[PDB]
Amino acid sequence: DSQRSTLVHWFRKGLRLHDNPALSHIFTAANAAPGRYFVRPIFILDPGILDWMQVGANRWRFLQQTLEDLDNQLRKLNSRLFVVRGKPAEVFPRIFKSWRVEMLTFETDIEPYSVTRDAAVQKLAKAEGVRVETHCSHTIYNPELVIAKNLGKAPITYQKFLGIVEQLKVPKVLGVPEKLKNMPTPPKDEVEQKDSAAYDCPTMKQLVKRPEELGPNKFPGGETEALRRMEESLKDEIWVARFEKPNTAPNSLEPSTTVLSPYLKFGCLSARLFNQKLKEIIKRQPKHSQPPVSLIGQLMWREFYYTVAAAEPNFDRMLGNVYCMQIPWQEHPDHLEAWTHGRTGYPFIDAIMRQLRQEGWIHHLARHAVACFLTRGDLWISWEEGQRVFEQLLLDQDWALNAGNWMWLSASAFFHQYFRVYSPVAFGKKTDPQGHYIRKYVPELSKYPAGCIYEPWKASLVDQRAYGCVLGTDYPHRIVKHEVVHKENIKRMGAAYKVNREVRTGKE
DNA sequence: ACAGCGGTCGCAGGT
DNA sequence: TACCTGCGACCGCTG
Numbered sequence: 001d002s003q004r005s006t007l008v009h010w011f012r013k014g015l016r017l018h019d020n021p022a023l024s025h026i027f028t029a030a031n032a033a034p035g036r037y038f039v040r041p042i043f044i045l046d047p048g049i050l051d052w053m054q055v056g057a058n059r060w061r062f063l064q065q066t067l068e069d070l071d072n073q074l075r076k077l078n079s080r081l082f083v084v085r086g087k088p089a090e091v092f093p094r095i096f097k098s099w100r101v102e103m104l105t106f107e108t109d110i111e112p113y114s115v116t117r118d119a120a121v122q123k124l125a126k127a128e129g130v131r132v133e134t135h136c137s138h139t140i141y142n143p144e145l146v147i148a149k150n151l152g153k154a155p156i157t158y159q160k161f162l163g164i165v166e167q168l169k170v171p172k173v174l175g176v177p178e179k180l181k182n183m184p185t186p187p188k189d190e191v192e193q194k195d196s197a198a199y200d201c202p203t204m205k206q207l208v209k210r211p212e213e214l215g216p217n218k219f220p221g222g223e224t225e226a227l228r229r230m231e232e233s234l235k236d237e238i239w240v241a242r243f244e245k246p247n248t249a250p251n252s253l254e255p256s257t258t259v260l261s262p263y264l265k266f267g268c269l270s271a272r273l274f275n276q277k278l279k280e281i282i283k284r285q286p287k288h289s290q291p292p293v294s295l296i297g298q299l300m301w302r303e304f305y306y307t308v309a310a311a312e313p314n315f316d317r318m319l320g321n322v323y324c325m326q327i328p329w330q331e332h333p334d335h336l337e338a339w340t341h342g343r344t345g346y347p348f349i350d351a352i353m354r355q356l357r358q359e360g361w362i363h364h365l366a367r368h369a370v371a372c373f374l375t376r377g378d379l380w381i382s383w384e385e386g387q388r389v390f391e392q393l394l395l396d397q398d399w400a401l402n403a404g405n406w407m408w409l410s411a412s413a414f415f416h417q418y419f420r421v422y423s424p425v426a427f428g429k430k431t432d433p434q435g436h437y438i439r440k441y442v443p444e445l446s447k448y449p450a451g452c453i454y455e456p457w458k459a460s461l462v463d464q465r466a467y468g469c470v471l472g473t474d475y476p477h478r479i480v481k482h483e484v485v486h487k488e489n490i491k492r493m494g495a496a497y498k499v500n501r502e503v504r505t506g507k508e
Numbered sequence: 509a510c511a512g513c514g515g516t517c518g519c520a521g522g523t
Numbered sequence: 524t525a526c527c528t529g530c531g532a533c534c535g536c537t538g
């Protein structure tokens with residue numbers, strides 16, 4: 001066994017065993033040629049990034065848990081995870097030689113950074129004699145094929161996108177890979193010979209530098225929890241079939257939706273598996289909703305944003321972004337800081353921003369509320385600042401999805417009915433008239449009557465004292481007046497739309 | 509051409 | 524309940 005070659009699967013996203021072609025191919029190959037190969041499933045961890053502030057503690061914890069679950073599952077196939085510390089640029093040249101790699105597989109990714117990184121690896125592999133198999137299993141439909149089907153253009157409307165993808169084939173959904181037979185552990189490389197635990201899963205202490213930012217562990221990481229959570233969500237087939245996104249609550253104390261987003265984001269759950277489960281349920285349920293609103297439709301919204309994002313390296317910025325309306329956002333540093341930390345003085349908005357920071361997930365319509373307030377609705381701050389904060393705090397932080405919906409919400413792309421504006425005060429009342437959500441995440445206001453808990457400034461000073469929370473002392477004065485600024489912002493939006501119309505017809 | 513339709517998720521005030 | 528209308532007057536697509 002001093003003559004074996006190594007087959008490598010590289011996990012970046014797709015942190016799962018189920019429905020993983022790139023991974024299954026590796027395991028099938030090893031079992032086909034017994035005694036021929038060694039198998040190294042790996043995750044590359046840059047130890048320098050741990051202090052990057054664009055990754056919150058909660059997301060680090062989620063990744064830590066995911067890596068441990070992935071190692072446990074690989075253990076059952078007579079394998080394990082190898083978490084190799086370093087950067088791909090130095091790691092691969094070293095391990096290609098060290099491990100005598102014959103093949104390298106991974107799941108493809110459309111994010112710019114990932115496109116250039118992978119291209120470098122492909123170039124190295126080519127020159128070094130290592131075969132590379134890539135698979136597009138992160139999404140149901142391959143953005144490339146969708147764009148090609150639509151004559152070289154990413155569809156910019158949902159219904160057109162649907163019209164294209166129903167013409168495309170849906171790939172077969174795989175099971176978990178086969179158990180490796182006659183696979184002894186590979187010989188230690190020079191790094192392992194020095195430290196036997198060099199490729200072990202990172203500890204919490206290792207991945208999480210600021211444990212004080214950790215909140216309640218409501219959504220544990222990993223494929224196991226992913227599948228358990230999915231199964232629980234699909235248990236009630238009526239709820240699933242009649243799902244309409246607009247009717248789900250932003251402020252329910254428990255999630256009104258599936259909360260599968262962190263799992264789909266990391267690849268802990270296969271979007272293709274989830275799509276298949278849904279379809280089987282809809283066939284059994286005669287009464288059911290349709291896209292855009294349906295649960296299947298939500299999954300297609302994921303696919304839509306990935307397709308437009310795949311055609312635009314600047315997707316996450318206003319300038320140079322083909323889709324994006326050019327809007328004169330302003331700098332408001334105090335207001336930005338107050339929004340960022342849930343200190344706007346709008347209890348509903350503050351409640352949401354605090355849940356987000358604490359727990360890593362907020363409901364889609366809660367995101368609408370705070371995104372609207374930040375941008376077109378009140379503060380007139382750029383969506384790129386909001387995007388940045390979300391990137392830091394969300395467990396499900398996704399380059400394409402985050403950019404896409406921020407553009408939607410700011411009416412910069414895809415959505416253009418800017419006359420519709422969420423009220424920081426009224427929107428939440430509909431589903432939570434008593435303000436239970438506010439009382440929980442803004443505890444200082446928990447004695448306010450429902451009559452003014454969404455608008456504490458309506459309470460007199462004597463009232464404020466009787467509720468044991470005086471505005472300007474225990475809770476902030478509202479940083480702006482929604483009833484005024486939103487009307488003026490509407491006109492700013494109309495004005496900016498006009499300027500863009502000129503430019504568009506001006507190039508003709 | 510340029511109008512009419514549809515567009516995941518507005519609000520307030522009706523009924 | 525779950526519709527409805529006024530508000531003021533958007534874009535992409537279609538033909």
Ligand SMILES: Cc1cc2nc3c(=O)[nH]c(=O)nc-3n(C[C@H](O)[C@H](O)[C@H](O)COP(=O)(O)OP(=O)(O)OC[C@H]3O[C@@H](n4cnc5c(N)ncnc54)[C@H](O)[C@@H]3O)c2cc1C
Binds near residue numbers: 257262299305403406
């Ligand atoms: C300003 C803003 C930023 C956002 N940033 C992200 C992000 O960084 N990462 C992320 O995954 N989602 C993001 N979303 C979309 C959406 O809010 C979340 O996907 C959803 O809240 C996750 O909860 P869920 O899993 O219960 O969704 P469900 O309603 O159960 O839907 C199921 C799955 O469909 C997909 N999905 C649902 N809604 C959307 C949507 N609007 N766009 C794309 N895919 C969707 C997700 O994969 C979700 O897990 C953002 C939305 C807004 C308005």
